[PDB]
Design a protein around this ligand. Sequence first.
Ligand code: HEM
Ligand code: PAM
Ligand code: NAG
Ligand code: NAG
Ligand code: NAG
Ligand code: NAG
Ligand code: NAG
Ligand code: CL
Ligand code: MG
Length: 325
Amino acid sequence: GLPPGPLENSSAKLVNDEAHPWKPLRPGDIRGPCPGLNTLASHGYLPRNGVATPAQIINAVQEGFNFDNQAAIFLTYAAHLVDGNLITDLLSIGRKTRLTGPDPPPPASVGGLNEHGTFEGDASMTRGDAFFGNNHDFNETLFEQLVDYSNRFGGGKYNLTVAGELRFKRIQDSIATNPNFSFVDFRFFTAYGETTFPANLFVDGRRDDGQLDMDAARSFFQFSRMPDDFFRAPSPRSGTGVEVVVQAHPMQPGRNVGKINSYTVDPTSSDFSTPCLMYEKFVNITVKSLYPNPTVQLRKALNTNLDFLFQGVAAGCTQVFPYGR
Ligand code: HEM
Ligand SMILES: CCCCCC/C=C\CCCCCCCC(=O)O
Ligand SMILES: *[C@@H]1O[C@H](CO)[C@@H](O)[C@H](O)[C@H]1NC(C)=O
Ligand SMILES: *[C@@H]1O[C@H](CO)[C@@H](O)[C@H](O)[C@H]1NC(C)=O
Ligand SMILES: *[C@@H]1O[C@H](CO)[C@@H](O)[C@H](O)[C@H]1NC(C)=O
Ligand SMILES: *[C@@H]1O[C@H](CO)[C@@H](O)[C@H](O)[C@H]1NC(C)=O
Ligand SMILES: *[C@@H]1O[C@H](CO)[C@@H](O)[C@H](O)[C@H]1NC(C)=O
Ligand SMILES: [Cl-]
Ligand SMILES: [Mg+2]
């Protein structure tokens, strides 16, 4: 289906309401590395089994959290192109599942949001690096480090100042311990934006003061659960304040080169000075590598989802056509 448009009414409102109660997981229900999508699934804004269409994800992030339309389109179609089934139009918000339907040929993985190095990647705040065995489950030790950083830099709340310090701490922890640490291109961009989302979208919309309390933080990050009486944000937003997080500790894109403490800058990577290059590499290298020579029906589904992705790309970038027009 076509990407949904913006909300007709973007006011703050109760989203933890009678039609969207929290429920625990049933056998087979899928949760993944994103506390936002996990919460929408666990309140029935998404299918509770954690398998959804791109149109369902965009409608859910808008309706439940007031995620802005352009950000919703960009992230949802990027995730879907690399992790979703383009023929069935289904994406797992976590593990690979037969529920997304018959797989395309390799090297396409259709691995769900849990797939390392497509969307998901290293130096997550509350999830471990894939090298350490689990890139998707809530991690109590890492959450307690978020709490400690909130206590030291946020007077006990998570805010953009905390985000700037913890983002850097998590990068330095991956450099020191993950010999395969990768922090380039799409992950370099998304890792900074994600640190703003708790301050912008998990804060009750009646306050909208960017100060997330640790009870609410644990409820979203661990239990995929809105606070009792949670109001969504009072206007559409996604990553506003990311400039504060970058400014705290500016980093160049790079990777460890098969050993700890070997962080080597990659001059072929996009960075914040080359946002259009991030889009071009994502399509020309990442998507094309999964679907190098697609059959007629896949090519058509790729071209449709690539058009939708471009709708979420900031004005002033040129659309690229890896399978022609
Ligand atoms: C619109 C579509 C969305 C997609 C496709 C998506 C996908 C993802 C993925 C794959 C990750 C894992 C990246 C990583 O840390 O390795 C992630 C992280 C995250 N997402 Fe989402 N997300 C979306 C929307 C949102 C929304 C609406 C929120 C909040 C309301 C949100 C909050 C987060 C947070 C806080 C993290 C970081 C978790 C951490 O580092 O501990 N996302 N998202
Ligand atoms: C734009 C904020 C920088 C980092 C935050 C994570 C990335 C995406 C948030 C939504 C922006 C969607 C369009 C970006 C434009 C582009 O891809 O060139
Ligand atoms: C918009 O939503 C608000 C509360 O969420 C409500 O008070 C108002 O009546 C709504 N506007 C329309 C167009 O219905
Ligand atoms: C290691 O990094 C490579 C790409 O640099 C990636 O393909 C691979 O999945 C990573 N593995 C883990 C578990 O980090
Ligand atoms: C959580 O993260 C810590 C710190 O990186 C790690 O040592 C631990 O093995 C992870 N897993 C669990 C289940 O706590
Ligand atoms: C985070 O909270 C601390 C303590 O209240 C404060 O000094 C700092 O200015 C806050 N930062 C933001 C961006 O709100
Ligand atoms: C992507 O491929 C297009 C041609 O399809 C080309 O114009 C563009 O320069 C490429 N961008 C890269 C590799 O960054
Ligand atoms: Cl919007
Ligand atoms: Mg991760």
